[PDB]
């Protein structure tokens, strides 16, 4: 078990900015902390790094203490926005992190071939863009086969081909068996590459689990577009007698609204019959879940399209 946070009520100034979460983490899963930019997310990310002390709580990273030197060799962190050393070179900064984490100096060349930076190595870091510094900032985090990544928005300022390819590099590390924690704020876009999500706000942890676990717990409407169907008949209105609201769209298509606890039965209601013929489902996404968990406790939605 990679990160076993168990019973941590972290306070400072007797304010309880992080109160009583029990967050596990698997050996290969890719967790996403999706809190606000306040007391929830960035406090809890510091305790896994061990640079913050857990007031009344045990944080057992990798089954060991969070501040041992034997576990910070097997850990990789990338902060939210870094401008490293604007007079140094590309290779030299990464060579400077090579001797610090204790990885071998042969690894510093293949990482700059791994991340597409060998065309821009041996150049001063003040000539790099914001994307290249994120490309460099990822490359230090992968130094010396890290068993726990910790990325805080690793996708900002980067080209969309590269961000798509970055999750492929994350997927190489998941199958290799490294638990990764993402801390993002661009939430539509990171939901296709996580296995679990931990949404926390107002200090406490609100909910946790996979995406299918959160949709099952939080009753949200779905969109089931089903074109190419039967006779535009009682097959349409039978879900209104089953407890739904079938929109009788014109060109032999229905958009049924369900409650998603009755989800898989409505699929085999049509797919068990002979007329699905290129249907399309539209689930509630991550932000529509993320809007909902604030409405369990916390803020209320805006007015006249403000904020």
């Amino acid at each position: 078990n990679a990160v076993e946070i168990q019973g941590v009520s972290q306070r400072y100034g007797s304010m309880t900015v992080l109160h009583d979460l029990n967050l596990n983490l698997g050996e290969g899963e890719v967790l996403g902390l999706f809190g606000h930019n306040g007391a929830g997310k960035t406090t809890s990310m510091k305790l896994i790094l061990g640079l913050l002390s857990p007031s009344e709580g045990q944080v057992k990273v990798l089954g060991r203490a969070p501040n041992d030197p034997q576990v910070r060799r097997q850990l990789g962190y990338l902060p939210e926005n870094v401008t490293f050393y604007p007079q140094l070179s590309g290779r030299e900064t990464l060579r400077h992190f090579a001797r610090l984490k204790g990885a071998a100096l042969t690894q510093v060349d293949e990482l700059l071939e791994q991340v597409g930076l060998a065309h821009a190595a041996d150049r001063r870091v003040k000539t790099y863009s914001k994307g290249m510094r994120q490309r460099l900032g990822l490359a230090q985090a992968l130094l010396g086969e890290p068993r726990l990544l910790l990325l805080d928005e690793p996708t900002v300022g980067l080209d969309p081909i590269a961000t798509q390819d970055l999750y492929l590099l994350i997927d190489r590390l998941r199958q290799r068996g490294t638990s990764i924690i993402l801390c993002s704020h661009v939430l539509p876009g990171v939901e296709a590459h996580i296995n679990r999500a931990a949404i926390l706000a107002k200090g406490c942890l609100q909910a946790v689990g996979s995406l299918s676990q959160l949709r099952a717990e939080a009753g949200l409407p779905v969109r089931i577009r089903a074109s190419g169907i039967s006779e535009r008949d009682s097959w349409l209105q039978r879900w209104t007698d089953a407890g739904h609201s079938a929109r009788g769209l014109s060109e032999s298509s229905i958009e049924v609204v369900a409650v998603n606890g009755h989800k898989l039965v409505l699929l085999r209601q049509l797919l068990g019959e002979g007329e699905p013929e290129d249907i399309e489902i539209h689930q509630p996404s991550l932000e529509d879940l993320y809007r909902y968990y604030m409405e369990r406790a916390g803020d209320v939605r805006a007015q006249e399209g403000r904020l």
């Binding site: 790094l49 640079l51 962190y77 902060p79 926005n81 400077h96 610090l100 230090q140």
Partner: protein
């Protein structure tokens, strides 16, 4: 060791600072220029009090140009929060920065007073090479210590502030206070009281300014005139020997480095 692995960065980062290499070549072309003007006129106690005054203006300047953005320049640059998640302590990335920036000042004054020796042994014919090597060996291993004081001053004023634009304001304030304000407050205290404030306390007030302890070390053997000393003529009234004056310069490092570590430990 981890202290040398982070010293090797700052040794390779300070030498790419173009503002350093301007005023470290300025220290070299002035130490030749002072020693060349001191060679055509001869005298010996004027070329010591002017070289020690040259390193009073520049060795605090190179030290404060190096290390004003050592901690706060890494904090707002984001690379300090990353560095604490490496197998290090807060005591190793400060002592490592002190070794890394300290070897630059040990090389910036070995260039300066090294070429000053070659502008005397190749200029003053028949000079005593034994007295030259000893006097400029005392200049080399004491202008580093003056440099290491203001290096350790800059770690104090970088950990306390939290914005780099305000760190340059404090580093300019420390350079003005210790070099040419404390020498003028002590002058104005002696003139306006006409030397009758305290006949025993006022020479001990030189020890609260490391540039004045630096000038008192190099002007030990070559006293000569009094007007070359000026406010440093109080140093003849100090009953302390010369060996404690080395130790009072080293105590200005260790107090202002342990203060630099105690501020950085609760950053």
């Amino acid at each position: 060791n981890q202290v040398w692995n982070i010293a090797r960065k700052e040794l390779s980062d300070g030498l790419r600072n173009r503002w350093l290499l301007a005023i470290s070549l300025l220290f070299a072309v002035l130490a030749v220029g002072i020693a060349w003007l001191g060679a055509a006129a001869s005298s010996i106690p004027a070329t010591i009090a002017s070289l020690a005054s040259l390193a009073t203006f520049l060795m605090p300047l190179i030290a404060l140009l190096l290390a004003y953005d050592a901690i706060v320049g890494e904090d707002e640059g984001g690379t300090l929060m990353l560095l604490l998640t490496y197998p290090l302590g807060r005591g190793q990335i400060l002592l490592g920065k002190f070794v890394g920036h300290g070897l630059i000042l040990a090389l910036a004054v070995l260039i300066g007073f090294g070429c000053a020796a070659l502008a005397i042994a190749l200029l003053v014919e028949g000079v005593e090479l034994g007295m030259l090597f000893w006097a400029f060996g005392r200049f080399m291993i004491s202008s580093t210590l003056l440099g290491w004081v203001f290096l350790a001053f800059a770690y104090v004023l970088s950990g306390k502030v939290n914005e780099k634009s305000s760190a340059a304001g404090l580093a300019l304030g420390v350079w003005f206070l210790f070099v040419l304000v404390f020498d003028l407050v002590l002058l104005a205290l002696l003139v306006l009281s006409e030397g009758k404030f305290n006949p025993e306390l006022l020479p001990w007030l030189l020890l609260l300014n490391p540039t004045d302890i630096y000038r008192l070390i190099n002007l030990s053997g070559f006293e000569g005139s009094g007007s070359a000393m000026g406010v440093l003529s109080l140093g003849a009234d100090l009953p302390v020997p010369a060996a404690v004056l080395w130790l009072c310069l080293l105590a200005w490092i260790g107090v202002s480095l342990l203060l630099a570590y105690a501020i950085f430990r609760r950053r």
